Amino acid sequence: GVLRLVMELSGEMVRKCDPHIGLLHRGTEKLIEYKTYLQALPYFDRLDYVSMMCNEQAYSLAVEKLLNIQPPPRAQWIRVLFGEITRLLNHIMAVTTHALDIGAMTPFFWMFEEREKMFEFYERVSGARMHAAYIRPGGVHQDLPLGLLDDIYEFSKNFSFRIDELEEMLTNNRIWRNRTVDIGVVTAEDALNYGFSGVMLRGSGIQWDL
Amino acid sequence: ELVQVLRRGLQQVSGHGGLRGYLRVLFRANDVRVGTLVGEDKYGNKYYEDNKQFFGRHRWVIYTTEMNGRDTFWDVDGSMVPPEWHRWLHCMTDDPPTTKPPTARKYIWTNHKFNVSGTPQQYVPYSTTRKKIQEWVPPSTPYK
Amino acid sequence: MWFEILPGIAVMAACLFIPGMATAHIHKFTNGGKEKRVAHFSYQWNLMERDRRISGVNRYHVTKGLENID
Amino acid sequence: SRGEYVVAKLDDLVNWARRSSLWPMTFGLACCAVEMMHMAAPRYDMDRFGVVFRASPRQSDVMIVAGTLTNKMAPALRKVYDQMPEPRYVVSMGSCANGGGYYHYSYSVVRGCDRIVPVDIYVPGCPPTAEALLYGILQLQRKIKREKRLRIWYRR
Amino acid sequence: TYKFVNMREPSMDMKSVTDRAAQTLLWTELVRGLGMTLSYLFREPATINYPFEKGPLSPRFRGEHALRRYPSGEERCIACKLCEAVCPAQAITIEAEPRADGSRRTTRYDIDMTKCIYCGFCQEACPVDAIVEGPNFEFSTETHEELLYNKEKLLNNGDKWEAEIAANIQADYLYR
Amino acid sequence: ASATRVIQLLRNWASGRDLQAKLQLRYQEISKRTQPPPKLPVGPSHKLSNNYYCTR
Amino acid sequence: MFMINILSLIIPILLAVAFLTLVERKVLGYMQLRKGPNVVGPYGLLQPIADALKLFTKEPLRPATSSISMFIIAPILALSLALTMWVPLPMPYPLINMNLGVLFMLAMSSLAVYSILWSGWASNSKYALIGALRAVAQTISYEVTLAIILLSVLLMNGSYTLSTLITTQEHIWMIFTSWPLAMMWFISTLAETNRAPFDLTAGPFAMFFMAEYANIIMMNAFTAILFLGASHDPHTPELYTINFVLKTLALTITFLWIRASYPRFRYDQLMHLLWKSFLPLTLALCMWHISLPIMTASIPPQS
Ligand SMILES: CCCCCCCCCCCCCCCCC[C@@H](O)O[C@H](CO[C@H](O)CCCCCCCCCCCCCCC)COP(=O)(O)OCC[N+](C)(C)C
Ligand SMILES: CCCCCCCC/C=C\CCCCCCCC(=O)O[C@H](COC(=O)CCCCCCC/C=C/CCCCCCCC)COP(=O)(O)OCCN
Ligand code: SF4
Ligand code: SF4
Ligand code: SF4
Secondary structure, eight states: OOOEEEEEEETTEEEEEEEEOOTTOOOHHHHHTTSOHHHHTHHHHHHSTTSHHHHHHHHHHHHHHHHTOOOOHHHHHHHHHHHHHHHHHHHHHHHHHHHHHHTOOHHHHHHHHHHHHHHHHHHHHHSOSSOOOOEETTEESSOOOTTHHHHHHHHHTSHHHHHHHHHHHHTTOHHHHHHHTTSSOOOHHHHHHTTOOTHHHHTTTOOOOO | OHHHHHHHHHHHHHHTTSHHHHHHHHHHHSOOOOOEEEEEOTTSOEEEEOTTSOTTTSEEEEOOSBOSSSBOSSOOOGGGSOHHHHHHHTTSOSSOTTTSOOOOOSSSOSSOOOOOTTSTTOOOOOOOSOOSSOOOOOOSSOOO | OGGGGHHHHHHHHHHHHHHHHHHHHHHHHTTTSSOOOOOOTTHHHHHHHHHHHHHSSSOTTSOOOGGGOO | OHHHHHHHHHHHHHHHHHHHSOOEEEEEOSTHHHHHHHHHSTTTOGGGGTOOSSOOGGGOSEEEEESOOBTTTHHHHHHHHHHSOSSOEEEEEHHHHHHOGGGTTOSSBOSOGGGTSOOSEEEOSSSOOHHHHHHHHHHHHHHHHHOOHHHHHHHO | OOOOSSOOOOOOSHHHHHHHHHHHHHTHHHHHHHHHHHHHHTSOOOOOOTTTSOOOOOTTOOOSEEEOBOTTSOBOOOOOOHHHHHOTTOOEEEEEEEOTTSOEEEEEEEEETTTOOOOOHHHHHOSSSOEEEOSOOOOOBSSGGGGEEOHHHHHHHHHHHHHHHHHHHHHHGGGO | OOOOHHHHHHHHHHHTSOTTTSOSSOOTTSOOSSOOOOOOOOOTTOOSSSOOGGGO | OHHHHHHHHHHHHHHHHHHHHHHHHHHHHHHTTSOOOOSSSTTSTTHHHHHHHHHHTSOOOOOSSSOHHHHHHHHHHHHHHHHHTTSSOBSSSBSSOOTTHHHHHHHHHHHTHHHHHHHHHTTOOHHHHHHHHHHHHHHHHHHHHHHHHHHHHHTTTSSSOTTHHHHHTSSSOHHHHOHHHHHHHHHHHHHHTTOTTSOOOOHHHHHHHHHHHHHHHHHHHHHHHHHSOOOOOTTOHHHHHHHHHHHHHHHHHHHHHHHHHOOOOOHHHHHHHIIIIIHHHHHHHHHHHHHHHHHHTOOOSOO
């Protein structure tokens, strides 16, 4: 993305690192205060724009908790299915952009073909490739089209080979291991005290998953 | 083996009307594949399908050389596709407008236009409402 | 498909054909249809100089056989 | 005469060369950058048009503003734009860059990147599909093909 | 249930140590990665031939906006201003008055397309199917001003795309 | 996908897998782009009786 | 007709380095499940010409404060050295038949660092100077092991004459006599030309690019002649020329393959690679290759 980073170096080693943020401060939280809840839903697509549906689900769950209602079973199953699809999209993006920044660059294309297929799924369900605005605080906007589940099954029965190819390019490669092993080591106590969550916790051995 | 693929390349050269058509399609569309003709367009676009290609490559259009007012031998764009063939060509439907055409209306455009941006016939915005306050008109007669 | 990389490679190959081949032909043309003489170590150069002196045309590659022994 | 014919043909050659190799640097400010990377993904393959992926600013032919430009970020974008060699073109991608978008009425957002730099092509959408950005790039190519610099110099 | 990703212990027998030494000295895994890249070169690319080929879309896809009309040719919009009230981006501006025949019609209907977030809330708020978001996406522009649509431009878009728009609504309206 | 039997063997050996079994490119196995109309059932509150809103 | 020979050496090399960009783009694209350029020209074939014209018609951004002298000198030296390094090579017959041709090529490659030093110095920037210093350090470090490996290999040839390498490999390639040295030589030639995984760093930019790509092709041709000896029939040298060109093309495509297959090192990691893995093995194998001909009574002729 866009990042300013002011650091102090003693030769090769990094002595201090101070990141400067706010280059993408749009003032979303103040803008939300002038919209209704429905009108304020699409901001969450734009918040973490690699996992659009997951952001929508969090907001929808909060509004549902405040409203004292609950989505029907089919809506909940749809939401969990698309949350897992969104996790696949986000992890592809994260791993491949990490590798690209290090210098690998080939799995980026390999996996962005699959990312294009999952934008096809997002598009079929809502008409929009990224910012679907499908998950509403009462359920989902529209039902799945008739042939969507079969295409999702067809996609998901070939993805393991793609992950295998990614691993063959990365996992046992000695350049990759020398670029990644023992870098950014964080203890469990520091991870907990610094407010970390997700893999940043679980990579340190903490057993936690919401 | 190799003989088979070279025979198929020779058939591709043959099926575009000879050498001239082969170079024409190669230099106009960068592709020399042959598919079954699905429809002709009233502006001259031709539509082909090939269901043994993978999804996305199984349908294509060869554009006309002359749409409404410009030579389009080189300067083609995707906005030249009329709406019915646009719907078929984007796989929004399995049905070409030949087998089942769109519903006819007296207001639907009979002549499709491409994107007219950067041309004298581009769109220029303006206010479509009348003047709210109208001013007082002094008399033409003298007062004294 | 992958064989569409072949044209450019072919062009590149043709370019890399030109220098070496050219050299060979030029060495045939300036050397009377024979490989250009190699002269290391200065005994070879002495042989070339003797050839150039005995050619009669100031050209080392004009070889004199037994027809010149009289 | 031949005097205008020669400049016409030479202008055609220069325009063809300039548009058949467009090297962009992209300001991946926000989520329109994901769609531009999808334009470089295998399905569309921007490189096959001669448009390389991630050129450096000092050898960039066109700038693609893809995302929201905030007040904190505007001077950096103008500084980057000034550095680029001429002839330089700017493509404005998405609602945020075109006119502020969903953050138009914000205290920290530039209401359109054309307050800061001149813009050649405006690609609409939130985000535009990678295919729409490709249509915009090809429209910029046609716009370059239309320009005629040597004739103006000869006729002036 | 939890899994361990990196909790393996290398064997210390002579054969395993020799295998790891052979990997270090002969670059076996590097050759394996080269082999995958080579294999992957020998398959069909995923690139489509735009603009002669187009990416797949669906009836639900939201593109450029259009104002529709009834089969008699009379416009569907009744100036209820629900689309303007629901717009998250305040991109719609509307003014209305009685027509010459007393009909409730708009005199101003603008959509700022540089403010629009293309959410499609406007077409799902419309009670008469007047404003829709059509399937066009190749409408890039060379100036900012040509992306500020008024009623004439949007009505022209409707008259231009009515065939495809009606077909898409026919395909999709049973899911709404 | 259509490839010569020798290209398939070469790519399979270099990769170490069977590439034809699981291909990256979609073919006629996908669903049709024209589908039958749906029906979309109603929810629990679509009763004609015993359905006062204050109870839900 | 010596000028014609010089021109027929220079011009085809520049065309080859122009179309190597096309080949690299095409090869990387197909390894990435896409294509390279296929729009400009029948098969992308006019893409290099469009690139060159566009580069030559773009505004040049002179630093407006830097040393204009060295700013203009650096590309001259780079391209002159790149074109000079092709003269010694025998394909089969060399343009210039040097007794110590290998040493001459070593000296040219050693000079090739002044261009980096001067371009970094004349950028009028501290960060670019840091990058230039890193590049110079990497280059000199790896040319150490290039020189040692090269003399170890030449101990089986009998001299520094590049033509004799054809005679040495009349029956069998040198790759079978010493493959470990060839492996370290290949990695050192990757690191010498600043190619991935060792790529840590208008007009003059194109000049520098031309010099780097010419150096890539020449280094791969030198590797082919050194380790992959083609058979040369004195009555038809075109067979040798075709064989040598095919091997050079294969090695260049292997460079592209490697760039497409791996991540890149850190600076300290490639420094440690050299100084702690290649240098010890290079010294050990230099000792071994000194001892080998004497032990087995297989010393090459020339003295
Ligand atoms: C030996 C001395 C050399 C000195 C320097 C000269 C530079 C090298 C000369 C060779 C230049 C190569 C020219 C290649 C141009 C042909 C490209 C052609 O295919 O373009 C088409 C033709 O368009 C134009 O008509 C081409 C005009 C190019 C110039 C015409 C004549 C110029 C000759 C003047 C040379 C004299 C130079 C004088 C000073 C050196 C339009 O295609 P395009 O729109 O792109 O793509 C659209 C995409 N589609 C087609 C797939 C849908
Ligand atoms: C009986 C008497 C016999 C005489 C003795 C012969 C015995 C020989 C046995 C050993 C020889 C092997 C030496 C060959 C080279 C070894 C160098 C080496 O192994 O270095 C590696 C590093 O090597 C690399 O990883 C460099 C790779 C860089 C990427 C380039 C990819 C290239 C791979 C593709 C194939 C290349 C083809 C090369 C040959 C081309 C021929 C022209 C070690 O570093 P690390 O694993 O990081 O750990 C060291 C710290 N403990
Ligand atoms: S223009 Fe739309 S899609 Fe692009 S970053 Fe802004 S909100 Fe997201
Ligand atoms: S699509 Fe959304 S943002 Fe655009 S006009 Fe309709 S309601 Fe407003
Ligand atoms: S377009 Fe529809 S929702 Fe908007 S004012 Fe007209 S009738 Fe009402």
